[PDB]
Amino acid sequence: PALVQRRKKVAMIGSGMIGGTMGYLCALRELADVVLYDVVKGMPEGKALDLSHVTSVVDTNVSVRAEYSYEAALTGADCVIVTAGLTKVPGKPDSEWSRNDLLPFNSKIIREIGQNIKKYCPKTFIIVVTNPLDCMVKVMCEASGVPTNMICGMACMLDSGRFRRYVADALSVSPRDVQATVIGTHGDCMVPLVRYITVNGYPIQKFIKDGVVTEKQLEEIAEHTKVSGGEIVRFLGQGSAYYAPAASAVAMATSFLNDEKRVIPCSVYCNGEYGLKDMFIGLPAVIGGAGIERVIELELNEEEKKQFQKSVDDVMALNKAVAALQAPG
Amino acid sequence: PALVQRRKKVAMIGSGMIGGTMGYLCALRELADVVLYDVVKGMPEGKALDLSHVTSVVDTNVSVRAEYSYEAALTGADCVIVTAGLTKVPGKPDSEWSRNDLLPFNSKIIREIGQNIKKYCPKTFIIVVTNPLDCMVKVMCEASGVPTNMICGMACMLDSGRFRRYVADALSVSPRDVQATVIGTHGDCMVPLVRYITVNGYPIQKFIKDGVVTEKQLEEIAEHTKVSGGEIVRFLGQGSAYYAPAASAVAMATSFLNDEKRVIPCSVYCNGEYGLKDMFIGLPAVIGGAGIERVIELELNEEEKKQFQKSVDDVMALNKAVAALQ
Amino acid sequence: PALVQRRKKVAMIGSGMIGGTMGYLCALRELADVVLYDVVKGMPEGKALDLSHVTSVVDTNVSVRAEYSYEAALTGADCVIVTAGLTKVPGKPDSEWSRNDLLPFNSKIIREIGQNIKKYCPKTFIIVVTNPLDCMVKVMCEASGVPTNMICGMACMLDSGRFRRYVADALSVSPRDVQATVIGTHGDCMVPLVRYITVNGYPIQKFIKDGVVTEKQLEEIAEHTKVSGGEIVRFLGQGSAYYAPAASAVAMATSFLNDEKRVIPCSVYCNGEYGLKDMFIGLPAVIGGAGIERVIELELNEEEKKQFQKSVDDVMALNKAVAALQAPG
Amino acid sequence: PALVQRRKKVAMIGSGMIGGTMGYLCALRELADVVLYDVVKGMPEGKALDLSHVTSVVDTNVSVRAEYSYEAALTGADCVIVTAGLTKVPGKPDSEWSRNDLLPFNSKIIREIGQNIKKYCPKTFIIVVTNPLDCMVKVMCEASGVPTNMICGMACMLDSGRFRRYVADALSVSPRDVQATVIGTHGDCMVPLVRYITVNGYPIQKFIKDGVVTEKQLEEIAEHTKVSGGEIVRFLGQGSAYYAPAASAVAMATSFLNDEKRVIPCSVYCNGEYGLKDMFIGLPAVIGGAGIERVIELELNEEEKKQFQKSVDDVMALNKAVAALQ
Ligand SMILES: NC(=O)c1ccc[n+]([C@@H]2O[C@H](COP(=O)([O-])OP(=O)(O)OC[C@H]3O[C@@H](n4cnc5c(N)ncnc54)[C@H](O)[C@@H]3O)[C@@H](O)[C@H]2O)c1
Ligand SMILES: NC(=O)c1ccc[n+]([C@@H]2O[C@H](COP(=O)([O-])OP(=O)(O)OC[C@H]3O[C@@H](n4cnc5c(N)ncnc54)[C@H](O)[C@@H]3O)[C@@H](O)[C@H]2O)c1
Ligand SMILES: NC(=O)c1ccc[n+]([C@@H]2O[C@H](COP(=O)([O-])OP(=O)(O)OC[C@H]3O[C@@H](n4cnc5c(N)ncnc54)[C@H](O)[C@@H]3O)[C@@H](O)[C@H]2O)c1
Ligand SMILES: NC(=O)c1ccc[n+]([C@@H]2O[C@H](COP(=O)([O-])OP(=O)(O)OC[C@H]3O[C@@H](n4cnc5c(N)ncnc54)[C@H](O)[C@@H]3O)[C@@H](O)[C@H]2O)c1
Ligand SMILES: O=C([O-])C(=O)[O-]
Ligand SMILES: O=C([O-])C(=O)[O-]
Ligand SMILES: O=C([O-])C(=O)[O-]
Ligand SMILES: O=C([O-])C(=O)[O-]
């Protein structure tokens, strides 16, 4: 009766919209046992019950449980996906929504979760989702102490997914066959690489020359990509996007758990790439069973480097501020 | 280039928790193009954008769009799934939650949607979700005018899914291999058929004799099944269940769209079964390309007949109630 | 960095029709890295290349490789699926095809593979497919020395699958919703349990009473089920069934690898069930991460017991003959 | 009663290794009802039975049947995939295997099938597989008379798949994220476009500079790609590749049936691309619910043009050869 093949276990630290949605993907695909942890009592248990019922409906078998302590939620977790935190600053108008405004509200939460991971599952792969993304990934890395290849932040796959959908619609092709990437920080300074867009590897410039799309059209698509998060915040009225953020985070977790080696841009540790040190920023990377196995350095032209450098300069400033204000404990 | 193969189209009338979740399943599986319709302005556009983004992330290609008029939402819909309505009575305590109290509020919404379906997509397959379920399916049938095999209500597959998950846990087996059914009205009077539970077709009785599960334990599972909706309502604090309800409605929609002929209990039109006529109640059925293709009239023991009659009394009282309101 | 999440590995010992087809299912679903091994050289390498190409076409990433030695094929295998052996006896009419005639040819092959599993992956989960199935599972158990819960033979899921397809067709329902089971040995004495058939747990007797199907039709379906293997052998002309046998063996492996705990009838070790000891025979069982986690004992009626006893007495006779004829070493 | 949603139907004309394998994919994914047709009697019924058994095993519900006549096999087919024909010349040594030699044997089989499609399912989407591919698609177009956007040949997705797998291995990434394309004639003169290789849209050139792979290695990969079909023929001893060929044809059929609009290189009708007219050759195309929806005409450098002209010369000689025969 000795267990030989144990199911993978993914812990959702934060069981709000994105956390619950990721639990749903795990149950739908029989990807792994799921634990839902939140500081709000009762709600995780209700969602865990609902998700457990999904397994019967779609004929899968994984365990979905709510846990109220960090130890019970984190022990044995192959992967930890962190969404705990605020989405909007209370009282501010949707018109002024800014992810950076979340910094003083979420930095302590993320640091605390990191300290618990260090204790309960130091060998886990951490995927941070909480905003402001790139700053939070660095806080998590420092607090959790895991090797730099075992921590990353989900964002660029989401921004790139938006970018891809818009291009797919313009070209009337499946997004599967649009490769479009956003690098940089997850915010107003993100960089949609219009120059790099390909359709099954064929350069977008050919479609322009051939009259399928225009330069302005692509420029508007890049701008739409940049403001997509806020666009959804304004339409929804309460909360922010969750369906695609969840699918992106789970796609990254699956590349790790199944050692797929997919090339997914995400917030990763920099050790010389693009000339950066001791910081995390959105870049193309390969995700496999050894975590972040490669960080891809793209050749940036004049204007791209300029936009990317802006995003770097900003996040370094925020990272300094966060460090200056970190609680001694 | 003339379009020869058109994607199926599913309209979610109601884009709250369950409507958005069903749209997610369609995008995740490339099942069909999706239209999100709701009375609340803005929110459906937000969810449609989010869902359209999902198609790139998971490499599928379906169109997800918000539409604010019945005409744009309903035209061309192969299947219409209706979740529009309230989940709880405003100002009422969680301990006092009752699907039956939703009648006064959701009755006119359902009737209006059916009138529009009659006008814009009379050939569609209708799946109702809005509570009080069995009552709302009848309202929808009367307002929409569709053939009786082309409308049903999602409820029993969810109730059965709960029943199956609890039994699966007790037996330590995959719920894929637990066949357990709930029939009757989706409410306090639903009827979990303990006697009919099977494990890959093997009678639960032998597992009781073998000591894997006890009779008292099965009775507790049936009771838990009955109050599982209210249990989630209380735990959540706001709203009600949505993940399993959406997966159940989509499973039904898929059996229709792909003519799978799955055996799925749902609220179906009674043509004399159990002596019932002109009403909808949860029964085991087969869903295929022609809609409800079979309705199973299981033999009930004394206790089941008694519970089923209470289920029947519940739905007839609700239908009487709407009648006083129509 | 160091690999933290390794892909599962399944070794197909025998790369003929069924072995290559199971390799195909693994590649298609990204289930596990695949190793193809065969005594015939050249062929496994051709199929491994073909299968490696499939991964690109269907966007998955697993390694499919041919291995020439037992050591290279078996080392590190989470599950080993054995199809090595003959399907038909040379120069013999299809009208006379019999799985028992293979006994003298396949006993030695199965014994040798088992001795190599013992050497190279004694902790693996073994799924035997090679005919005559129930006899070969016992030879494999003895030779490999693995715990009795870590070995089973694939047959009843296929026989039950045939049974279910015929019933599904008679009732016009999806076979997902037909629970029909065949127990006993994989051959002319198998026992399709007509009395136990259910449609989503509803007794088949209800459908007979309703006028949808008759007892006579059901008995004809049981007979068809029994002769389905020979029916395909005669239609194909060369070889035997492989699409469904492969799908059945991989479903069983998946239930093990993902600890699904599916209830799948298969040839399993009996230590008291149905009154049998020290032998393998087709029975309903639960397959999970600990291997065969439960052997289900059905309450059989007088006639069912008689049909099952015939199958038991028969396989006990073949097993004794095999033991009698075995080389001391 | 009346069926509203009918399952898709795909007819495999030719039920050997590739035809049976595509049927397997249909049953495995519940993609469509399947018909297996072949000149060989018995075998198709054997595989149809085997495949029908698969549906139960994997919990799907599609109908798999063998059909004796063209009329029964073709009537109602949404898509027809043709693999009928020989794989190698009887008595010819494996070291002398050439798709071009199959011409005299397969051209008549393909013309006959084409005439039958015109008769029984003129509105179907035709995917030809039979070698020598580009030539056989032309034979099929002429005989079947279908709209130019409703016929294509599967080959370059397979050749590109090979190309992508080798590059994926060299780079240590999933082939999902390698975009590599082979255009031209499916034979020794096919053109793997090394310059157009991308890793999730990132130019392969930077990977060369980063030392992940060398130019010499990419060139050896391009050569391996060209001779992969023969490599497999040699290793197998009998017959040729069938798992990836089947997956490639079904992926094409799926993009058509669900109107996915995937960009898949395949043999398509030329209306002037590269000055090519009245012939089929492998080019990047968009396959959707209206069949071939766009043909992409990439800018080629000097070397690519040289290699593509040899590809063009190859199929033009074959088409001239067929013309002389029938
Ligand atoms: N990186 C991206 O691409 C991306 C995209 C969308 C949203 N986000 C961010 O992800 C986060 C979660 O979004 P959401 O929609 O799930 O939000 P949500 O409000 O629905 O849920 C956040 C959850 O975290 C919980 N929480 C708060 N403090 C906690 C603590 N100390 N410990 C444990 N749980 C705690 C809350 O109780 C709540 O249940 C936000 O910061 C949001 O801005 C990031
Ligand atoms: N049958 C079942 O098994 C089952 C299970 C759970 C919930 N339900 C019921 O399903 C319904 C939906 O639940 P939910 O969680 O999605 O609720 P929800 O509150 O999230 O959304 C209901 C949505 O319908 C909208 N709406 C209201 N009036 C409308 C109208 N006239 N036209 C279009 N949209 C309108 C609301 O604005 C809201 O967005 C409720 O009635 C709930 O009780 C049924
Ligand atoms: N249990 C079941 O339900 C079931 C169903 C169908 C077939 N089978 C049996 O499964 C087996 C395989 O069927 P198949 O269609 O794949 O046959 P196949 O002839 O296509 O392939 C069997 C393969 O095993 C190889 N082989 C022979 N001796 C070997 C050895 N010593 N070591 C390694 N490989 C060796 C052969 O070279 C050949 O490639 C047969 O015994 C068949 O009767 C069982
Ligand atoms: N385009 C590509 O990329 C590609 C790749 C591999 C193989 N192929 C080709 O595909 C074809 C099929 O390969 P396979 O592996 O399935 O071969 P196979 O020999 O297994 O099957 C060919 C089948 O066609 C049948 N057939 C012959 N004449 C027929 C006729 N007049 N009508 C109906 N059926 C007839 C045969 O009886 C046989 O069952 C071959 O021509 C092969 O060269 C193409
Ligand atoms: O971060 C966000 O809220 C987003 O982009 O969806
Ligand atoms: O109807 C309900 O709210 C339920 O059962 O989930
Ligand atoms: O054993 C067999 O060959 C079968 O049943 O397919
Ligand atoms: O056409 C072929 O045989 C091939 O390329 O596999």
Side-chain angles (χ1 to χ4, degrees):
Chain A
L3 184 64
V4 176
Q5 293 291 331
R6 187 189 293 294
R7 300 179 188 155
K8 301 306 171 64
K9 176 186 157 166
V10 176
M12 313 303 185
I13 303 304
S15 307
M17 293 320 280
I18 300 177
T21 304
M22 293 186 303
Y24 192 44
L25 294 180
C26 285
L28 291 166
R29 305 175 177 161
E30 200 179 75
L31 173 69
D33 285 331
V34 174
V35 162
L36 302 181
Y37 167 85
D38 202 286
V39 286
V40 168
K41 302 302 175 179
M43 176 271 287
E45 185 41 46
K47 292 195 184 170
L49 273 165
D50 194 7
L51 291 175
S52 77
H53 301 157
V54 171
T55 66
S56 299
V57 177
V58 304
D59 296 324
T60 55
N61 194 20
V62 291
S63 162
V64 188
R65 284 167 50 78
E67 300 291 355
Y68 284 108
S69 69
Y70 278 123
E71 169 156 6
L74 297 166
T75 298
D78 289 291
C79 180
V80 177
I81 309 179
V82 188
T83 60
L86 273 177
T87 51
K88 307 172 71 175
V89 175
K92 211 163 214 289
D94 293 341
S95 67
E96 295 162 49
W97 179 79
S98 166
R99 304 182 182 76
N100 279 346
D101 286 348
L102 298 172
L103 193 57
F105 303 88
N106 294 339
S107 65
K108 63 144 198 190
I109 287 175
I110 293 298
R111 183 172 182 252
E112 189 181 271
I113 298 174
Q115 295 178 310
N116 280 282
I117 283 167
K118 178 175 204 177
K119 171 169 187 185
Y120 305 117
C121 57
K123 293 284 189 188
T124 202
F125 182 66
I126 311 172
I127 293 172
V128 177
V129 174
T130 304
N131 274 320
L133 195 279
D134 310 275
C135 298
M136 290 312 89
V137 183
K138 195 188 194 309
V139 169
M140 180 61 72
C141 182
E142 300 180 315
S144 70
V146 301
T148 54
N149 57 300
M150 294 301 288
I151 168 142
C152 65
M154 182 293 292
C156 289
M157 186 183 198
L158 171 67
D159 300 319
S160 293
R162 290 159 167 172
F163 195 12
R164 289 167 61 212
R165 180 68 268 179
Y166 303 144
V167 172
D169 281 349
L171 297 176
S172 292
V173 301
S174 171
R176 158 63 182 81
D177 298 312
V178 177
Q179 291 76 47
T181 287
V182 174
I183 58 175
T185 57
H186 184 54
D188 292 348
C189 292
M190 69 174 68
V191 191
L193 302 168
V194 170
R195 187 173 63 95
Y196 278 97
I197 297 162
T198 62
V199 182
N200 193 38
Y202 317 137
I204 195 65
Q205 294 86 351
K206 169 70 173 184
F207 296 82
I208 287 171
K209 196 179 177 189
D210 290 356
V212 182
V213 283
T214 61
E215 187 65 34
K216 176 60 168 178
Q217 183 174 11
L218 294 177
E219 177 285 312
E220 289 286 2
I221 280 175
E223 174 62 24
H224 190 185
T225 293
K226 296 176 188 178
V227 305
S228 285
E231 177 179 37
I232 287 170
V233 162
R234 290 178 273 292
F235 278 132
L236 291 187
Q238 282 183 59
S240 38
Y242 51 98
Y243 288 119
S248 299
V250 169
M252 295 162 59
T254 298
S255 197
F256 167 66
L257 294 167
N258 271 15
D259 181 26
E260 302 182 323
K261 299 192 192 303
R262 288 193 66 183
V263 181
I264 299 179
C266 51
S267 192
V268 293
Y269 183 70
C270 286
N271 187 201
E273 297 93 340
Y274 302 80
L276 313 175
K277 296 273 190 169
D278 201 57
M279 67 172 273
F280 286 81
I281 194 160
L283 299 170
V286 177
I287 298 179
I292 301 311
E293 307 188 345
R294 184 188 285 296
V295 173
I296 296 162
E297 181 185 72
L298 298 174
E299 285 192 58
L300 300 181
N301 65 16
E302 181 161 70
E303 185 49 40
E304 290 158 357
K305 290 183 173 178
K306 184 177 107 170
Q307 297 161 307
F308 183 69
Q309 186 63 53
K310 212 168 306 182
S311 78
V312 166
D313 292 342
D314 175 59
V315 80
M316 290 191 299
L318 292 200
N319 284 346
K320 281 194 175 182
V322 169
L325 288 159
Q326 181 215 60
Chain B
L3 184 74
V4 176
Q5 295 293 323
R6 178 180 295 284
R7 302 181 190 148
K8 303 308 177 64
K9 169 180 161 160
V10 184
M12 313 298 181
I13 303 297
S15 305
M17 296 314 292
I18 298 173
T21 305
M22 291 186 299
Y24 191 43
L25 296 178
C26 293
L28 290 176
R29 301 167 183 168
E30 205 182 69
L31 178 61
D33 286 331
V34 173
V35 164
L36 302 184
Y37 172 90
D38 198 283
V39 60
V40 171
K41 157 176 179 163
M43 183 274 272
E45 292 171 82
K47 289 189 183 175
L49 277 163
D50 193 8
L51 293 179
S52 78
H53 300 151
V54 168
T55 66
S56 297
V57 173
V58 308
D59 302 318
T60 58
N61 192 15
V62 296
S63 170
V64 186
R65 292 162 49 71
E67 301 281 3
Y68 289 102
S69 74
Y70 279 126
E71 171 163 31
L74 298 176
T75 300
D78 292 287
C79 180
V80 177
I81 311 185
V82 187
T83 58
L86 293 196
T87 55
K88 311 173 82 180
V89 175
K92 196 106 167 182
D94 287 343
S95 62
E96 287 174 37
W97 184 74
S98 169
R99 303 182 184 77
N100 282 1
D101 294 339
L102 302 172
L103 181 82
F105 309 80
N106 302 338
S107 204
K108 48 200 170 190
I109 293 177
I110 294 299
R111 177 178 180 203
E112 175 182 89
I113 295 164
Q115 299 175 319
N116 278 276
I117 288 176
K118 182 162 181 185
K119 181 171 198 178
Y120 300 117
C121 59
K123 297 173 180 177
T124 199
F125 183 60
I126 309 177
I127 296 178
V128 181
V129 176
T130 303
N131 274 315
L133 197 278
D134 306 277
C135 182
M136 298 301 93
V137 186
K138 181 175 185 183
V139 174
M140 180 65 68
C141 188
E142 305 176 320
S144 66
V146 303
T148 55
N149 59 299
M150 295 298 290
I151 171 159
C152 64
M154 183 293 290
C156 288
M157 187 180 200
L158 167 66
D159 295 324
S160 297
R162 291 159 167 170
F163 195 16
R164 291 170 57 209
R165 182 66 272 181
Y166 302 149
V167 172
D169 282 343
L171 301 168
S172 292
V173 301
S174 172
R176 154 68 180 83
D177 295 310
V178 172
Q179 290 76 49
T181 293
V182 173
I183 63 172
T185 190
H186 184 59
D188 287 337
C189 288
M190 63 172 77
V191 192
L193 303 175
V194 180
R195 193 164 68 79
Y196 282 104
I197 299 165
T198 56
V199 179
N200 191 36
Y202 315 135
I204 193 59
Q205 286 73 6
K206 189 51 174 43
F207 289 81
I208 301 173
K209 293 190 172 169
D210 293 340
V212 189
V213 64
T214 70
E215 292 201 16
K216 184 198 179 78
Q217 183 175 5
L218 291 176
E219 179 49 37
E220 305 176 315
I221 286 163
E223 290 307 310
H224 185 183
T225 295
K226 302 169 78 168
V227 306
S228 290
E231 174 176 38
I232 285 169
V233 160
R234 280 180 280 291
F235 277 133
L236 296 181
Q238 294 165 69
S240 38
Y242 53 98
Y243 288 119
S248 296
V250 172
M252 287 164 64
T254 299
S255 194
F256 166 69
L257 298 172
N258 292 334
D259 182 29
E260 304 176 323
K261 304 186 187 306
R262 283 191 74 186
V263 182
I264 298 177
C266 50
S267 191
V268 293
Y269 184 72
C270 295
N271 288 295
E273 291 85 356
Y274 294 116
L276 309 172
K277 291 186 181 176
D278 216 292
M279 62 171 276
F280 286 77
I281 202 153
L283 297 173
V286 175
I287 302 184
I292 307 307
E293 294 170 13
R294 174 87 160 89
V295 172
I296 301 169
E297 203 161 346
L298 296 171
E299 180 187 347
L300 306 177
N301 69 11
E302 162 141 299
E303 182 57 23
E304 298 162 336
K305 291 193 179 227
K306 184 185 161 192
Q307 294 180 69
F308 188 69
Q309 180 70 58
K310 288 176 185 165
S311 246
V312 170
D313 294 339
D314 188 12
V315 52
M316 290 187 312
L318 288 167
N319 296 337
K320 180 187 173 180
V322 290
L325 315 163
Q326 179 182 9
Chain C
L3 185 64
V4 179
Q5 296 294 327
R6 178 187 317 275
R7 307 189 190 143
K8 299 304 173 61
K9 179 181 174 269
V10 180
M12 311 303 175
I13 302 301
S15 301
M17 296 317 307
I18 300 175
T21 308
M22 293 183 300
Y24 192 43
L25 299 172
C26 287
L28 292 173
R29 307 173 177 156
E30 204 178 71
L31 176 63
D33 284 332
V34 176
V35 161
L36 296 182
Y37 166 87
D38 203 289
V39 284
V40 171
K41 275 181 188 175
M43 181 270 282
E45 180 55 71
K47 293 185 177 184
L49 282 161
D50 192 10
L51 292 178
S52 76
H53 301 153
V54 171
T55 68
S56 292
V57 175
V58 305
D59 296 328
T60 57
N61 193 14
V62 293
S63 167
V64 185
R65 300 177 179 198
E67 295 303 339
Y68 323 87
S69 64
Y70 275 127
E71 187 282 309
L74 296 166
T75 304
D78 293 287
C79 174
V80 174
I81 309 189
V82 190
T83 55
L86 300 188
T87 56
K88 301 168 78 180
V89 185
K92 192 171 191 62
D94 297 336
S95 64
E96 287 176 71
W97 180 76
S98 168
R99 300 178 187 77
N100 288 342
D101 291 338
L102 307 171
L103 198 58
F105 308 87
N106 296 345
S107 290
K108 186 185 202 180
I109 294 175
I110 292 303
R111 189 180 176 188
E112 180 179 276
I113 291 166
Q115 294 167 340
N116 277 272
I117 282 167
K118 190 183 224 158
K119 279 179 193 180
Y120 304 117
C121 54
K123 300 186 191 180
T124 200
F125 184 62
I126 310 174
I127 292 174
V128 175
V129 172
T130 302
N131 271 316
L133 197 279
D134 307 277
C135 295
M136 294 308 93
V137 179
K138 178 166 190 177
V139 171
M140 180 63 75
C141 185
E142 296 190 60
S144 74
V146 300
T148 54
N149 61 301
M150 297 293 285
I151 170 154
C152 65
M154 180 295 291
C156 291
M157 190 182 197
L158 168 66
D159 294 325
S160 301
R162 283 162 174 171
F163 195 12
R164 292 166 62 205
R165 181 68 267 183
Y166 304 141
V167 174
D169 282 344
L171 304 183
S172 305
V173 297
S174 171
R176 156 63 180 84
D177 295 313
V178 180
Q179 291 77 48
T181 286
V182 177
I183 61 166
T185 59
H186 186 52
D188 294 350
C189 294
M190 64 179 75
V191 194
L193 296 172
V194 178
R195 191 176 62 102
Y196 275 89
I197 300 172
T198 63
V199 174
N200 192 40
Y202 313 140
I204 189 62
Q205 290 74 5
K206 185 66 194 177
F207 295 75
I208 290 169
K209 194 177 225 306
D210 276 354
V212 184
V213 70
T214 66
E215 242 300 302
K216 174 182 182 200
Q217 270 176 274
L218 293 175
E219 295 168 351
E220 298 178 318
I221 283 171
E223 176 60 21
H224 190 182
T225 296
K226 291 185 199 173
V227 303
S228 294
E231 171 176 39
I232 286 170
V233 158
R234 292 179 273 288
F235 276 135
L236 294 180
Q238 293 198 60
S240 27
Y242 53 99
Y243 288 121
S248 302
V250 168
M252 294 167 57
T254 300
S255 194
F256 168 64
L257 293 177
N258 280 357
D259 185 25
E260 302 180 321
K261 304 193 188 295
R262 290 197 59 190
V263 175
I264 302 181
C266 48
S267 200
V268 293
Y269 187 69
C270 291
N271 192 179
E273 303 87 339
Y274 302 81
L276 302 175
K277 310 266 191 190
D278 194 35
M279 64 173 268
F280 291 73
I281 194 169
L283 297 167
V286 177
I287 300 179
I292 302 302
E293 300 190 351
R294 174 181 290 290
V295 174
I296 292 163
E297 190 186 61
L298 300 180
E299 207 147 42
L300 300 176
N301 72 11
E302 180 173 60
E303 150 104 286
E304 292 163 348
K305 287 194 296 184
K306 177 183 178 183
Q307 302 169 295
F308 185 69
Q309 191 62 54
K310 188 178 177 181
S311 176
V312 162
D313 291 350
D314 182 65
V315 79
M316 286 185 309
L318 287 232
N319 287 336
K320 190 175 183 175
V322 180
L325 289 165
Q326 218 167 60
Chain D
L3 193 68
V4 178
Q5 290 297 321
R6 176 179 304 273
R7 297 177 195 155
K8 300 307 172 65
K9 167 176 169 183
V10 177
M12 315 297 177
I13 303 300
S15 304
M17 298 309 271
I18 296 173
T21 308
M22 298 184 291
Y24 189 46
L25 298 181
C26 291
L28 285 175
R29 302 173 180 163
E30 198 180 80
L31 175 64
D33 284 336
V34 170
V35 163
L36 299 181
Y37 169 92
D38 201 289
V39 60
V40 167
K41 64 179 189 185
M43 182 273 288
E45 301 175 67
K47 291 184 179 176
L49 274 158
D50 194 6
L51 293 180
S52 64
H53 301 158
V54 170
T55 63
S56 299
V57 174
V58 301
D59 300 320
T60 57
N61 195 17
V62 297
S63 165
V64 184
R65 298 175 44 152
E67 285 304 345
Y68 194 71
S69 67
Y70 279 121
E71 166 164 23
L74 296 169
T75 297
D78 294 289
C79 180
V80 176
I81 309 186
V82 186
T83 60
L86 298 190
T87 54
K88 52 212 292 212
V89 182
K92 181 101 173 181
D94 283 358
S95 51
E96 285 169 26
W97 182 73
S98 169
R99 300 175 186 84
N100 288 356
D101 297 333
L102 303 171
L103 188 289
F105 306 90
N106 299 341
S107 178
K108 45 182 181 189
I109 292 170
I110 294 293
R111 181 180 51 177
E112 177 177 281
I113 291 163
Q115 290 161 346
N116 275 283
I117 281 169
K118 169 187 284 185
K119 182 176 189 175
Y120 302 116
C121 59
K123 298 169 165 175
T124 201
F125 183 61
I126 308 168
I127 295 173
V128 173
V129 176
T130 304
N131 270 321
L133 188 95
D134 310 271
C135 182
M136 295 300 97
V137 188
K138 177 126 167 53
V139 171
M140 178 67 68
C141 182
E142 296 188 315
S144 67
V146 300
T148 61
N149 59 299
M150 299 295 286
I151 167 155
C152 68
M154 178 298 289
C156 289
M157 182 181 205
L158 165 68
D159 299 319
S160 296
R162 287 166 173 170
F163 197 13
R164 292 165 60 211
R165 184 65 264 186
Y166 304 147
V167 173
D169 285 346
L171 296 180
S172 293
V173 299
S174 167
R176 154 67 180 79
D177 297 310
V178 171
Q179 291 75 54
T181 293
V182 175
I183 55 171
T185 300
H186 177 65
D188 300 342
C189 284
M190 67 176 75
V191 187
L193 301 177
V194 178
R195 187 170 65 93
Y196 278 104
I197 295 170
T198 62
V199 181
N200 192 41
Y202 312 138
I204 190 61
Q205 292 81 348
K206 187 58 168 43
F207 289 82
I208 299 171
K209 293 186 183 183
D210 290 346
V212 190
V213 65
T214 71
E215 305 208 356
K216 188 173 192 182
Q217 284 160 6
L218 293 171
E219 205 36 56
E220 301 168 322
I221 280 162
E223 290 294 329
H224 191 179
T225 298
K226 304 179 67 173
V227 305
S228 289
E231 179 178 34
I232 284 162
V233 158
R234 273 152 32 213
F235 280 129
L236 291 180
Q238 284 211 300
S240 43
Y242 53 98
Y243 289 118
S248 296
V250 167
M252 288 166 63
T254 296
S255 192
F256 166 66
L257 298 169
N258 297 313
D259 181 33
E260 301 180 323
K261 298 186 198 299
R262 294 275 299 285
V263 177
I264 297 177
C266 53
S267 188
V268 296
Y269 182 91
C270 299
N271 286 296
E273 297 84 354
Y274 300 111
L276 304 188
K277 284 179 176 181
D278 192 28
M279 61 178 269
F280 287 74
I281 208 174
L283 301 170
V286 179
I287 301 180
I292 305 301
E293 303 186 352
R294 163 177 269 117
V295 178
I296 300 173
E297 178 180 11
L298 302 174
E299 169 173 39
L300 306 179
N301 69 11
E302 189 187 339
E303 177 58 24
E304 291 164 347
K305 285 176 175 180
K306 179 174 177 184
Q307 286 184 43
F308 190 72
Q309 182 61 60
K310 296 183 193 173
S311 238
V312 168
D313 295 342
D314 186 29
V315 63
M316 294 204 295
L318 297 165
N319 292 345
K320 219 189 171 185
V322 154
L325 282 165
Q326 52 187 59

